[PDB]
Design a protein around this ligand. Sequence first.
Ligand SMILES: Nc1ncnc2c1ncn2[C@@H]1O[C@H](COP(=O)(O)OP(=O)(O)O)[C@@H](O)[C@H]1O
Ligand SMILES: Nc1ncnc2c1ncn2[C@@H]1O[C@H](COP(=O)(O)OP(=O)(O)O)[C@@H](O)[C@H]1O
Ligand SMILES: [Mg+2]
Lengths: 642, 583
Amino acid sequence: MDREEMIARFAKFLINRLKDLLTVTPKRSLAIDWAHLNSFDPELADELLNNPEEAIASAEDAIQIVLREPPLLVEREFKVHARFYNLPKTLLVKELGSEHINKLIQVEGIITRVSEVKPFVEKAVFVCRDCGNEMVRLQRPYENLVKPAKCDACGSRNIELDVDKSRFLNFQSFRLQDRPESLKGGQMPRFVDAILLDDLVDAALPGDRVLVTGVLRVILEQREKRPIFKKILEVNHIEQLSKEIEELEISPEDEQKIRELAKRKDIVDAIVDSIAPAIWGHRIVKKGIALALFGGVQRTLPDGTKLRGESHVLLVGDPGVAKSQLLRYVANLAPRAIYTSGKSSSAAGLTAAAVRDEFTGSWVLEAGVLVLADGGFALIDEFDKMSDRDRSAIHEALEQQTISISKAGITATLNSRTTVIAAANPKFGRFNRHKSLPEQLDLPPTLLSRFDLIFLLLDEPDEKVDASIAEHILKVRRGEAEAVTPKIPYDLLKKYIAYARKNVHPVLSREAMEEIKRYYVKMRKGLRRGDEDGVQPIPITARQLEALIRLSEAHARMRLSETVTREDARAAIEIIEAMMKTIAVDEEGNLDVSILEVGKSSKKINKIEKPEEKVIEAAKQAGIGTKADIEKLLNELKSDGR
Amino acid sequence: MDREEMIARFAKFLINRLKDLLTVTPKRSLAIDWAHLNSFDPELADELLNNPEEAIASAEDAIQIVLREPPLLVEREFKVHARFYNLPKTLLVKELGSEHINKLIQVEGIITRVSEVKPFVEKAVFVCRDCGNEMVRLQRPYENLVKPAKCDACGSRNIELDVDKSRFLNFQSFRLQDRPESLKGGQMPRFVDAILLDDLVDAALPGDRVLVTGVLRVILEQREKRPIFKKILEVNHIEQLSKEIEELEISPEDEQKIRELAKRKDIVDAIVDSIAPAIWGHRIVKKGIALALFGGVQRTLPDGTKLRGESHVLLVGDPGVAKSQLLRYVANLAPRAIYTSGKSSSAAGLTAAAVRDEFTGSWVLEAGVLVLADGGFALIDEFDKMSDRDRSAIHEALEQQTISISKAGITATLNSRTTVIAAANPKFGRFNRHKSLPEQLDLPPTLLSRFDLIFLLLDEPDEKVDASIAEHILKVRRGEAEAVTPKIPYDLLKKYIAYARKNVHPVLSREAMEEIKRYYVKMRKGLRRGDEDGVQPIPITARQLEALIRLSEAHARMRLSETVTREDARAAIEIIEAMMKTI
Ligand SMILES: Nc1ncnc2c1ncn2[C@@H]1O[C@H](COP(=O)(O)OP(=O)(O)O)[C@@H](O)[C@H]1O
Ligand SMILES: Nc1ncnc2c1ncn2[C@@H]1O[C@H](COP(=O)(O)OP(=O)(O)O)[C@@H](O)[C@H]1O
Ligand SMILES: [Mg+2]
């Protein structure tokens, strides 16, 4: 409708926006604002949403005249795509339906899958020797194979493709899903597959918050029915979502009561009691999860490296200790949390992997729970039952917070900046106190060196602790008030965590620096003298020193304090000392578990032990171990071939 | 268009290049300069980028007349290829898009895969059993064998292949990637598949930075999948990258600043402090890494050998000593250094591998970090974790700087001129001083001799160094600048290594040769008798002194000195004597 008139209307609104483009020649696009066009010509901006097919084409040719007419006109009239980044309304992937088809929409979400840089032909010239050479059957990259039945010029059927005169363009297809931060309330990860064109290809990675704004197109992929079978959003402009929309927002009236709650006494005790009030006990585990929620400060050094600011927690224990429930109450309490299980229900269930799509068979990089939850939390239940592919990449995603996959024709790196509050189960049914943790845990020994807090939620029969948990469960089932309700409401506490992780950034103080120093040197020489003439036990490692500073800064952020008070660094010591008992202390002495084992004894005996009817007796009178211990030693040696 | 006019245009410009053609009679491809054609006719030269199919066809056909009509002509119309070794814009691999298909492009980069010689057909004359065998079809090397449905002469379908009259020509396919050293900031390992014709077959090997100038084709037609979405690149001329473009830039003002840093005092200690300022301690270890950065000179002796200048260093330490950190700060600081781990998911994470390609199932030789970083450094953490093929292949890459791989029909000999900065981890938990290193390290004993320096890092529970490293670690996290500001800027010190290795070439002096001959005989002959006869322990030795010559010349190159003075040799003793101290 009035295409020639729209060109004059677009040229009228077109000039400071085209003025800078007139200066920068290599810029192959033009970012146009809809609200700006709405102010100049509201009727013209209304035609953008109504008929986007005739509006984008007429605007491109119009601004071309606004380009050649003034000075600094480029020699070659490069394609000027009209990119309308802003729109009056912002839609949702769940809210998106068949009504917005062929309408200029602006849907927000997160990209989960993405294809390679697949070239596609724009002007499909078919080579017909008989006649009809330069004829073009304009095909879209998502559309199926186009082929004419007969040449209209000469009636010949010798049809073939002329890829020598064909002008090929770039094309990429991604999958836009609901954001797990706020749109997860619907509990439906709906997806709308979209396409990307020149200056849009390779503009966003999977697991990233983007605000795409394009035309909702359709494709008749199936011939079983005349109506469309699948809709594909033809993205006109892509843009990453702003910080305010992709993060939790707090009302100004709540900003006062959040600061008021920080000034309230025993704020640390109130938050601990407010985390999972149904489960009894585990106050050390509750405070450890609280320190993981109020994660430490994440700083970047000018040398290029970036200091870690997350505290991963692992909950190992026997079945029946409500270790899976603890991953539920925090799943809804945390601002950005993706509750999932260790089971590899998908190819990219835990870590992002590459899988061939069902549409064209091309490998697409699908994100995982450790990618969609970037800058948030990911509570992984049953962490001991994982696939071999996921077990190999979590070693890098937990420390470096990056997932570099370079297989299946997809090479890139993601940002796995997530706090993995996981919970694993022992492979022997119940955890034994006479064996180390990796001995009964399916996780690799190197993987345990990544978690800053590893609590042992063991089951121990005691008349005092069992009578309290028995009466507590009865109060929960009876509907008691103070047995289920938290001291701080979940709605306010969810904003309290987001307020601390965004505004309050504590810094180390001289008082806390002396406490962190005195604690680290105190653990040294704790058990090294014990295993002399061999591998001396290292009670604490510099890795754990960085974890101690993260927990000390975590307690200061939980109190909404801009500095690490000496009392805050002391609180992290108690939590570390409590975990010491669980592992690396109060068990096979210090250094227990460590990277693999204490070594104080096991490793020590390994070097002494290092047609075999003579070697079994030789180990007998040697006195290195009893006949039962030296028996089990060679079973593990035969496991590795020794 | 105007193909007849283009032939007259090319023949008009067609001078000195043809003068070279008469000199070398077997010249199947004559090289033509672009600036000579651009100055002759910019409109004619512009037609080469728009449609090179008709441009290169009319260019060779026009000079074919110049091959016959002028005197000294060839007896027949000898096939000549219009080779072009220059273009106005040199594009990049990541910058190359689908908008350059069917256009003459000039893209630079490195090669990682190279196939063998495949005698594919150029024009397959399909013989029909009944009649009509006269028909032909221009078979392409990148495309598979095509098959027409029926014959036009008699309409018969009894078609068969005729390998007698078919002209089979040489064909090779290679994979050209981005630069791993120059474009490390781009972080894009993208590649474009390319084919090599008769003149360019076996031209380069994987790990060779070349500057190809060809036409971006397209393989959109595929029998397996019609929406193949694949674009290939036919190359017209290949040429290795020049040092002006394939290395870091050093301006004359910058070269002055680098010379000014040499006039600055105590840079022999400031360089050690600047390398990885976040991690505390390791004065001798950090100085050893600096000693490896300014590697020794490489001189080809008249006897056929060459003095190795790649001073390999190994950092065997315990977990928690931040060894990996040291491999990170130096990787970005070094001019040519790519970070990689021991375990790798690719085909060749190391020197070389052999596996059939995914396109046609042909065996292609793959490349790794020890060849992509030739002329530089390669830092590999988890060096102890490596496959059986890795352990045997590196020994030739480290010591002899060569990669001899002839399996799977890929006859090739790569040159791995790399200075490796490795860091192994003993399998028996924490490293125990009581038992030796080879008992705790899976590395072969001869591999340890390849590393000139071996630092035994450790984390001792000494409250003295603990309180010092705890106060230092707190300073790094607190944001203190002193902990994260090097004595020499990272960008300035990166140019300091390139200017030192390229220009400064220290030569042996009497003062250094006497100290290197004194310190050798007071220690080698001192413990030569060894103990209890049998296999006597060998401290310093010929190979040790060799490495020791690298250590003395590295100190002179570190301070931008052409003469290795005795104190530069004395500084070499302080580092090598610590090696027997720590080990
Ligand atoms: N401290 C506790 N307070 C209340 N219930 C508990 C507590 N510890 C364990 N339980 C009980 O354990 C049962 C199973 O919990 P669950 O989360 O399935 O543990 P797991 O998954 O390890 O088996 C629940 O019915 C819960 O009531
Ligand atoms: N001299 C030092 N200065 C600062 N940090 C150190 C030092 N030595 C060890 N560290 C600690 O070691 C940790 C990194 O060690 P890492 O390289 O991961 O060892 P590994 O490779 O065996 O796992 C860092 O968190 C750092 O705090
Ligand atoms: Mg490491």
